[PDB]
Write a protein that binds this ligand. Structure first.
Ligand SMILES: Cc1ncnc2c1ncn2[C@@H]1O[C@H]([C@H](C)O)[C@@H](O)[C@H]1O
Ligand SMILES: Cc1ncnc2c1ncn2[C@@H]1O[C@H]([C@H](C)O)[C@@H](O)[C@H]1O
Ligand SMILES: Cc1ncnc2c1ncn2[C@@H]1O[C@H]([C@H](C)O)[C@@H](O)[C@H]1O
Ligand SMILES: Cc1ncnc2c1ncn2[C@@H]1O[C@H]([C@H](C)O)[C@@H](O)[C@H]1O
Ligand SMILES: Cc1ncnc2c1ncn2[C@@H]1O[C@H]([C@H](C)O)[C@@H](O)[C@H]1O
Ligand SMILES: Cc1ncnc2c1ncn2[C@@H]1O[C@H]([C@H](C)O)[C@@H](O)[C@H]1O
Lengths: 237, 237, 237, 237, 237, 237
């Protein structure tokens, strides 16, 4: 039992899927996992552990922003023996060729947060995902006939940034998606010796927003979820 | 209707109490407000609006960390016309004379986050509360026979900080409590021309943790809540 | 005695009013203090001790800038037993609604300086005044039929700054006035465990571009001193 | 031609291998390329063009340090149509489990340099390699019966640094190797829209304190070059 | 007349000697200048203009700290036709072989102030003296038979620095004297287009703690004055 | 023998002239030194030792960029008894009155590199040349009838800077030449206890874009060489 997770060692699987702000952990568990049991309820942050094709897997949200996900990912790693963390959420795009509903894999994550500088003696720590997890996600996506773009994400501290010019800079440097967690999670993974990966589905254009109906949402979200789950089975092979 | 608040202008009162990680908005509304109606449900972030001694007041959680509360406080201010925001939560203490269950008023909030430097051309922005709100809280506390200490809080980005030496620095400079939101909220209030105040109840010692039973928790939490609500009535006078 | 103050313990009261201009200190002592005696003249930084309505009080200039006032306030606190430093100065206006001859109280002080970062491990230290001293000042002002605005001041290192764009940033975030010492004094007070407050009269509006010239300006300046002196009396009671 | 490269469009292939040591470039061309011709000699930074298994390939030194390699990679990309820069160098080991003669692939590169901050508005830019080039390299290594570790490299500005405490920080956060160019090259690739990858052989273990001397060391160095060359062939297919 | 100097174009010579202490400027005028006339007394910052062997010369205090002297030097340069500023101050020694009353000439000035970073886009501006002025001072000292070291000074914002270790770093890099103005003055000279030089007399030793002592005290503060005045004549020839 | 120099104590003179281009070091040795003998060829960084009017002198390239020259200058100072380093390089002019082939002497060197901040606890280290060396060079130039400006150089990390505006700031502060090594060399000289000086020949103009031209080209690159060599003899006397 930790300060924010009311569970015990063994309650969570070695692999944890963490739903972004959209997806719900309860939805993932009852739709993709079999024999799911509830392992956490603190702050309504429902956690679940079940199996996917015989493989043990847990699911639990990470909350909005670096400070929030940093809490949970740290405790899962040091107190519940979790080895892999896969975040599945949404992101905004700044690149014209990146479209609404595209799946983006964050091999790296830029940020305007100060958490990584505090850890790295104020130098540049390249917040990156585990390579194998990236390749598993990409391969699982190809197997499902889904084209997944791999590159940098940008984890912002302020959803409502005062500096609108930064989005242009992001576009110039190839950032595929803007979210608020990746860099924080990768920082924790490196700090405590674990592996992590962030997968996002473009929910909107920070430029010229398109128009995909609610029917064209849960269908793409299920895709990202399958990618995540299937990528885990590939990693075991 | 905003990106994270599914409500319309008028749904929230001009004054909003935002519960810290402990307290629940639903609890506050059904225990201290009369005729409360639900005004928000997005992401299970329940919002409520009712009255306290005839005074219109809304309550809704802000989530963990600066990035999270920055979202909600900004939208409440610019899209729902909110003028005052009062955060009520818990904090850790570094000072020996500051005890478990003491009420602390954050006239100012230090931080290791970069959000205020991004707003203030990388200079030092003194993240402060509205003076009148501070004095109202203090006076309301005296009226209830509660001694409230006023000073600096510290809003950390990392609950699990790699630099343990910083707590000593905090103690040396008189920080009364460690939390993760104040500086973020004060930053938003100043950016969009509103007023804000953070009130915390010491939940633990980052030094030698005491032992206050669960009976010695909800009793102090109710105190902080009353302080907050009564401080609003004083502000109207 | 120290290299900058040629006096001995006891020569100063436990409360010291400090204007930037040393000649202003002589003006204060001759105008409001009874039985005032000069207690320092090193570097021409005149210091005086006398009584106001029977209360022992000292007044001494602190010079221009954070580095200057930092030396004097520090020595006053650690070598002369001073417990309170009120600074009485002038500030430049940035907000259009802050008019000439307006009394401003600095609950907090933003800054250009790196002194607080040096003290606070390169993080954001919210440089604040002592709460009770601020409240005492507002009440003293009220009793004198004067409206006092409480908020943020900005302590600049460069009176003649090359970045003219900073003034708009200051206005956006509600800075009430621009001066050059508050943040330094508040840093010292916290570092050495004392209490401080900065009170200013607006002598110029950087907006409409206008300084001062009138018997009314000198009236407002005296009102600030009266607020300072009376506030210490309220503090004792 | 430019002030640093005396060649014309066409003289270089669209893919360039780049070791730090210009004499190493001559070694590569003579050992693995057929019909190799010297295409640059300015400042002694030898460049060569030939073919590997019928594929046009170029190889040129980039000199020591981020500032040096930044000029060459930039010119190669904007003036000679180069689309891929693979760097083949040596790195110092920080992790005890990373042994001598180990092939390291830099998916990301941390750094001491301020170049990416200059480019990215003083924020954290995650300097990463191109995903497909990394994957191509791992597969080429696999086909050659070689284990390749993929992760973070650290690009230092000072080979002789005064802060010896940084090496422990590097180890804690899992840096696989220390070199001096990766982050600079990755910054250039992103700024000018090209693709890059850095591959290194561990020539020394800063831990147990040991460099190299053996026919086995030269064997591993050749294996890295073979991995680089074969990986570009896989990239075309 | 400027905001801090009540004088008129022509009241000052084109070269001004400036100690931090206004009273020292008074001593210099009465002891080394003929027909000395006071030209300023605002804020007690005494300024004088006279003759030295026929050369029109001025001497005026600049106060303590970069912010203070920045104001005076600036106004003198933009409104009184001042071409050369020669600071004649005191400094704290950090090196073992430097003793009280030793004369140091600062061709460069390090600092922990942020003023030059604000002027130089946050990069490193090498705050240096005018070369010819340094050479004139070195020559004048030789002809006078007075020893003098030439090198880097360190301009501190905090006389009472909370970072004791920094003195070791200063010693390591050969800092000759610790004062509080040089870097600022050099910054102003470069920004407003004039020439400046700082000459200091070791006022005390930071390691041994031996402050000024014996009649020898000011006697060397005479040496630096003579060197400054004679350097001016040399510069004219 | 050091990691980058295959030579032995005694192979180098106590003073070394260092251009960035190894081939230029070769030209200098063959054109100005008698009995020139190659003493290093590692990484192609040609080093030579010979005689100039009887004085033993060495000349060796240091490569492009602060990181590169930091390595060579350091090793020469700690393992080959080198007391003086004289960089003889090229630079880009930013001021209108500075033309191609003008000789500049850098008594100071600004920079956007982070190396000195890493050495100086993140404060501003004034990277300066040895005063006597500057004076020797100025005198040697006078006797040679060669014009030469003395002032600040700017050592850039990025030749292809993404920040064009910075050149305007450089111009404003009187930067005489933009190169890429001076600040680093000065940092090394101070850290390891030696003396250094940088002399540059305007290689081109950043505003007009006129790079090297006419036979006059290297002819002035001869002027700086003559000045450097003659300055050494002057320094010996
Ligand atoms: C454009 C944009 N900017 C910032 N965060 C974004 C975003 N688009 C999607 N997100 C993701 O959704 C949540 C935010 C709070 O809406 C967060 O959970 C976040 O990861
Ligand atoms: C010691 C300590 N450190 C950081 N946050 C603390 C804290 N004590 C209480 N908090 C508050 O409770 C939540 C954290 C996430 O537990 C957050 O909501 C926070 O405001
Ligand atoms: C507009 C403006 N900018 C900067 N400082 C200002 C100011 N208006 C007033 N001050 C105050 O007066 C002094 C400066 C030196 O003149 C200082 O003591 C300072 O506190
Ligand atoms: C331990 C260690 N530290 C720094 N750089 C190192 C290193 N081990 C190898 N390198 C690589 O080799 C070059 C340095 C110049 O010798 C550089 O090209 C660099 O990439
Ligand atoms: C040890 C030490 N540290 C900092 N400044 C010092 C010093 N010793 C002398 N000075 C110089 O004298 C003044 C200080 C405030 O006494 C200042 O004007 C300053 O330039
Ligand atoms: C315009 C400009 N900017 C930066 N460096 C410049 C320059 N003009 C000349 N240099 C000097 O020559 C080398 C550069 C890489 O060509 C480097 O060795 C450098 O010192």
């Amino acid at each position: 039992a930790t300060p924010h997770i009311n569970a015990e060692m063994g309650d969570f699987a070695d692999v944890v899927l963490m739903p972004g702000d959209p997806l719900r952990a309860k939805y993932i568990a009852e739709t993709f996992l079999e024999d799911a049991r509830e392992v956490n309820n603190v702050r309504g942050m429902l956690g679940f552990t079940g199996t996917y094709k015989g493989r043990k897997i847990s699911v639990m949200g990470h909350g909005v922003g670096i400070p929030s996900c940093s809490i949970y990912t740290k405790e899962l790693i040091t107190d519940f023996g979790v080895k892999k963390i896969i975040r599945v959420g949404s992101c905004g795009a700044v690149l014209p060729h990146v479209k609404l509903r595209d799946v983006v894999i964050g091999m790296g994550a830029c940020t305007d947060s100060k958490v990584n500088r505090i850890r790295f003696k104020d130098h540049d720590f390249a917040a990156i995902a585990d390579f194998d997890m990236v390749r598993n996600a990409v391969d699982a996506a190809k197997a499902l006939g889904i084209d997944a773009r791999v590159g940098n994400l940008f984890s912002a501290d302020l959803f409502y940034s005062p500096d609108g010019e930064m989005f242009d800079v992001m576009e110039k440097y190839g950032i595929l998606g803007v979210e608020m967690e990746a860099a924080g999670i990768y920082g924790v993974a490196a700090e405590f010796g674990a592996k992590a990966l962030t997968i996002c589905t473009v929910s909107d254009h920070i430029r010229t927003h398109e128009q995909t109906t609610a029917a064209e949402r849960q269908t793409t979200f299920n895709d990202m979820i399958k990618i995540a789950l299937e990528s885990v089975l590939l990693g075991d092979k």
